[PDB]
Amino acid sequence: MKVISLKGGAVITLLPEDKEDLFTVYQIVDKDDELIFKKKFTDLVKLKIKVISEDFDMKDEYLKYKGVTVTDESGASNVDIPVGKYLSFTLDYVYPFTIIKQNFNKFMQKLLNEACNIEYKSDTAAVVLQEGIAHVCLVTSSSTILKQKIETDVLKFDEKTEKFYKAIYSAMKKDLNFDKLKTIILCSPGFYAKILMDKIFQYAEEEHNKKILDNKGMFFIAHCSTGYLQGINEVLKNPLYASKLQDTKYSKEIMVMDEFLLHLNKDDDKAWYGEKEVVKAAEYGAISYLLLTDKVLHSDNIAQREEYLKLMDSVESNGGKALVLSTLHSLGEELDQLTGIACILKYPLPDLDE
């Protein structure tokens, strides 16, 4: 993503760069917002509309806003174009547009800002190693960009192995961002990947590096024919691997949705759902984990989402954390089945429903 300018409300001029940015745009543009762009029906012309509805298909890489045109007295658009007609805008990755936005919030601003960081984007890191070489890597939305070229029986200790590993190790916690990643792949022709995996978790407890130890489930071990850059792509497109590329991607959400029901199924009073019950649990300050969907926070009810934003800070300003789940995926679709809002508590709050 690229934000050209940006100057309550606001005026955002921005450029979506891939389908991951189309989704970002999706959660920002609101009904009644206004949109300056270019269309043709070299006969291109600058148009402008008040948004009315949306057509979104991430798989199809398709975002379209339907709306009616409006007066732009700056003449800077809608020239010769009669005000009041129907007109739509299909997003393209080529020309930027401007959003005259009314309720731009810090949650939206976080997402947009994050989308711009071409690091914060990439959420899959690799490490490929033949029997002597390793590559700390970063899988980007197009390229498998390298971060650091490091260099029988393969199962027995050695001083030049246990030096080598700690190198990969460090080179990783240096060249990599475990906050913004969701998946880390270790793949190797041979035992090398597995060996690298444990050496990693070995040194972790030495440093007590809970940034890695907390996420033992973002790591994925794989085989590939060569320990060169080739390997990454054998795995990415290997179907017997696909499902479990997802299980690691959502390691955290998978874990959080777990405990939520652990409590919920023990008729346990430590887990709840419903706008009502969660706002109350917030009054006690008892929330360890707030669970919201992306849908409920970009609701049409602009009133209702004022509440939920407060609830997010409120909850964290109090030593609890928050989690936005995508209704485009199983966990979000499930949290959906529960009104897109629920929580986990620090203690049992009997009868928050009475």
UniProtKB/Swiss-Prot annotation:
SUPFAM superfamilies: Dom34/Pelota N-terminal domain-like, L30e-like, Translational machinery components. Keywords: Cell cycle, Cell division, Cytoplasm, Meiosis, Metal-binding, Mitosis, Protein biosynthesis, Translation regulation. Changing residue 21 to A: Reduced No-Go Decay (NGD) pathway. Coiled coil: none annotated. GO terms for cellular component: cytoplasm; Dom34-Hbs1 complex. GO terms for biological process: cell division; meiotic cell cycle; nonfunctional rRNA decay; nuclear-transcribed mRNA catabolic process, no-go decay; nuclear-transcribed mRNA catabolic process, non-stop decay; positive regulation of translation; positive regulation of translational initiation; rescue of stalled ribosome. Its main location: cytoplasm. GO terms for molecular function: metal ion binding; RNA endonuclease activity. Its cofactor is a divalent metal cation. Changing residue 273 to A: Reduced ability to trigger the No-Go Decay (NGD) pathway, reduced ability to promote degradation of non-functional rRNAs. It is found in: Cytoplasm. It holds the Pfam family eRF1_2. InterPro entries: eFR1_2_sf, eRF1_1_Pelota, eRF1_2, eRF1_3, Pelota/DOM34_N, Ribosomal_eL30-like_sf, Transl-rel_pelota. The keyword Signal does not apply. Component of the Dom34-Hbs1 complex, a complex that recognizes stalled ribosomes and triggers the No-Go Decay (NGD) pathway. In the Dom34-Hbs1 complex, DOM34 recognizes ribosomes stalled at the 3' end of an mRNA and engages stalled ribosomes by destabilizing mRNA in the mRNA channel. Following ribosome-binding, the Dom34-Hbs1 complex promotes the disassembly of stalled ribosomes, followed by degradation of damaged mRNAs as part of the NGD pathway. The Dom34-Hbs1 complex is also involved in non-functional rRNA decay. Present with 1720 molecules/cell in log phase SD medium. PANTHER family: PELOTA, PROTEIN PELOTA HOMOLOG. Monomer. Component of the Dom34-Hbs1 complex, also named Pelota-HBS1L complex, composed of DOM34 and HBS1. Belongs to the eukaryotic release factor 1 family. Pelota subfamily. This is Protein DOM34.
